[PDB]
Amino acid sequence: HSDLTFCEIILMEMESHDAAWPFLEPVNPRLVSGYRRIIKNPMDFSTMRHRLSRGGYTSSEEFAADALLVFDNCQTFNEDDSEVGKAGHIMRRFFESRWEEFY
Ligand SMILES: CCCc1c(C(=O)N2CCC[C@H]([C@H](C)N)C2)[nH]c(C)c1C(C)=O
């Protein structure tokens, strides 16, 4: 699959990016007050990595949905001028541009 070939490329790039540090594992709701209540569908790169390694994606659109969810969740919970928020903006611009550079 050439669709699954690119998400693999773009995920590897997001995983190693400098600004990826808030998105490499799930947010622990025990550690973050309010997170369970505000964020209905948590998402992160390791979860996307797991879903890829298992064959859980069918189309690249499903992959795109999960990527965008990471950044929608980031902007729903974090302030744009917060440390995690700034990192999410850098990561979201990277994803959007890289995704468009292919499709
Ligand atoms: C208060 C900010 C919490 C947060 C992180 C975050 O700090 N992590 C990600 C998981 C563990 C990482 C650790 C340093 N290894 C750090 N990431 C996100 C998306 C959030 C939020 C609330 O949206």
Q: Where do the structural domains in the chain lie, given as residue ranges?
A: 2-96
Q: Is 79 in the pocket of ligand 1 (CB under 6 A)?
A: no
**Residue identifier of the C-alpha nearest atom 18 of ligand 1:** 22
Which residue is listed with tokens 């919970």? 77
Instruction: Provide the experimental method for this PDB entry.
Output: X-ray
Please report, for residues 57, 60, 65, 80, 82, the alpha-carbon distance to residue 88 in angstroms, rounded to integers and kept in the order given: 23, 21, 16, 9, 10
What b/e string do you get for 44-56 counting C-beta neighbours within 10 Å, with b at 16 or more? bbebbbeebeeee
Kindly write down the DSSP assignment for every residue of the chain, as one continuous string.
Answer: --HHHHHHHHHHHHHHSGGGGGGSS---TTTSTTHHHH-SS---HHHHHHHHHTT---SHHHHHHHHHHHHHHHHHHS-TTSHHHHHHHHHHHHHHHHHHTT-
The CATH homologous superfamily of the domain defined by 2-96: Bromodomain-like (1.20.920.10)
Nearest atom in ligand 1 to the alpha carbon of residue 27 is: 10
Q: Is the Cβ–Cβ distance between 39 and 71 less than 8 Å?
A: no
